[PDB]
Amino acid sequence: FRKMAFPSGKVEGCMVQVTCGTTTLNGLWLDDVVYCPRHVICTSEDMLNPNYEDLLIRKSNHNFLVQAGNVQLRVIGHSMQNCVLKLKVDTANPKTPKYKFVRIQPGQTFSVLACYNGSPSGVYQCAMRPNFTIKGSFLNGSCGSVGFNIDYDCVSFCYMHHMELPTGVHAGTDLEGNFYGPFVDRQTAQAAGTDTTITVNVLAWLYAAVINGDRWFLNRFTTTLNDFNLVAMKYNYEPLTQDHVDILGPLSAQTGIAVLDMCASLKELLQNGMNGRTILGSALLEDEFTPFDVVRQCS
Amino acid sequence: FRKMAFPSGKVEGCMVQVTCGTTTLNGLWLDDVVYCPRHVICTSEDMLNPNYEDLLIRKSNHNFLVQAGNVQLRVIGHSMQNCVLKLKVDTANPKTPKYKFVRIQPGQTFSVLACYNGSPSGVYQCAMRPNFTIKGSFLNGSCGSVGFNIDYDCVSFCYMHHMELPTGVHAGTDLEGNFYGPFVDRQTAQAAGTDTTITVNVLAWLYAAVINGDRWFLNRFTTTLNDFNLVAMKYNYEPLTQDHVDILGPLSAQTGIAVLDMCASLKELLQNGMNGRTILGSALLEDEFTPFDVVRQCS
Numbered sequence A, B: 001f002r003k004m005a006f007p008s009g010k011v012e013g014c015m016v017q018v019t020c021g022t023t024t025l026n027g028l029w030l031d032d033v034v035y036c037p038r039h040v041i042c043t044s045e046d047m048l049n050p051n052y053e054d055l056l057i058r059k060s061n062h063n064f065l066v067q068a069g070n071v072q073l074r075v076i077g078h079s080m081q082n083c084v085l086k087l088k089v090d091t092a093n094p095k096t097p098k099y100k101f102v103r104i105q106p107g108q109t110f111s112v113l114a115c116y117n118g119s120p121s122g123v124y125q126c127a128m129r130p131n132f133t134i135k136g137s138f139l140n141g142s143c144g145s146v147g148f149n150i151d152y153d154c155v156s157f158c159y160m161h162h163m164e165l166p167t168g169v170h171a172g173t174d175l176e177g178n179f180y181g182p183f184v185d186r187q188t189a190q191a192a193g194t195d196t197t198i199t200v201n202v203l204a205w206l207y208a209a210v211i212n213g214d215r216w217f218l219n220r221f222t223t224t225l226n227d228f229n230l231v232a233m234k235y236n237y238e239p240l241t242q243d244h245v246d247i248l249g250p251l252s253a254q255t256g257i258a259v260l261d262m263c264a265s266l267k268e269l270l271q272n273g274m275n276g277r278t279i280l281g282s283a284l285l286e287d288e289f290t291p292f293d294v295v296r297q298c299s
Ligand SMILES: *[C@@H](O)[C@H](C[C@@H]1CCNC1=O)NC(=O)[C@H](CC(C)C)NC(=O)O[C@H]1CC[C@H](CCC)CC1
Pocket: A025, A039, A042, A047, A138, A139, A140, A141, A142, A143, A144, A161, A162, A163, A164, A165, A166, A170, A184, A185, A186, A187, A188, A189, A190
């Protein structure tokens, strides 16, 4: 049982390079539109307190250099939507996959295709944390890299990368340019607030551990939803709801372990730690696998 | 800092479905050859003790059904090379990337494109362990999935998946069909022997931790190569050689931390554990990042 990303080929064919002045970052080319972070128009001496409307007024279509491999694309229109720029180009991407834009919920996962200069470097799996940050791996030049899910043949884009927070975690927008969380695109230290653990995902992962033979943490206790949550609150775990219980139903069925029994085991793990033991090769409780992720990987 | 796989698009275009009888698994289609595990010719009542030469003699070209999406490929020749079958087909793969076959060394990493029925399901990063197993995520139907590295435009294929061992780890071949390690393709419980920790990779990861602000494990001690190795041997760590020291040179330079100083810190971690603390979000010492991986991800 592994942290697995979606195959990235459909997205690789959409990445381009966008340059305004000496600033370069990544854009996403779908149909005849290229989407990228609006701070591509900033110089280094703009990023502390940018007035994006005023900065963009000085820019014309020909100030945006868009490159797909050896080919320069011709920009024929531009507009700003929230924190993203949309550059209309004279060529529809022949590699455009079936796609949609979605705004994902906290607790859900997605794959990131980290890119530099329009070129894919690697792919990994992330969760949108309750506090609307992600724990990525991003360097200068990585903005405009995107997060996505694949649903059959269809790519659902849910994230575009914009910035780092003081804790080393990351923040960005949906593909309409609206940040996840309270963040703004300027070069200041910003607060994400308490991060809470995604309880339903921890339980999914404990189920995955059982499926994979690792079963030492199970016990002879059970609990109630209200009583577990008294312990969840204590550890900054999200409260568990009945909807979560029913989402875990299939995993509970495949293992024959009642959800509230697994909850009792989680309580003991939370209160007693792992006593140097491990679960699926980890000495920490993992919360970046959804139930759907766990079902996907054990089928 | 994240476990990151290579972008998988160039490999996605090479995966096909291979069916012999009711057995189906994955094949790799490059030029006019499809490569797949030879046990595609086995029935369930063959896999305990297969005589592959005798089984293959009963098979003709038209007994191999090869499907790339909606398209059936026509098999015009077949031969067995070690534990792989080579099916010559009447169509060269138009998506064949620049590629080569390499036999990778223990301690090196590669990306796995896990596939079922010829269709990519997900991508993750693995290491070839010292004992020539890998810790993958593979289900029935996953054989013929491949591991690879990408070097510029060129895909280096290094692994094809064949089996599970009793410890839940995995074993397979290079693309010439030669197993890594002592394993054979038959459905028996087989021994991998003691797994040792890839010391140079643990040090690379400790350097990555320093680069990423996490520095509590550093100390005021140093050591010698011989004296550390006395402690490496104890914990089933690979001995550190001067070649490893020089491989770590660049990371040592970027951090200004002498390799033998980092070794002294590792010794303390090995002898004292992590006292409930964490390193790059892990409560265990990670050994599946090479120095090159760490350089790649911090650039
Ligand atoms: C992409 O352009 C880039 C991505 C980050 C660079 C370092 N890692 C990243 O994730 N974004 C920025 O540089 C961004 C530009 C803004 C105008 C949107 N600025 C940014 O992330 O500034 C951060 C740097 C770290 C700092 C930490 C304080 C302790 C907070 C501001």
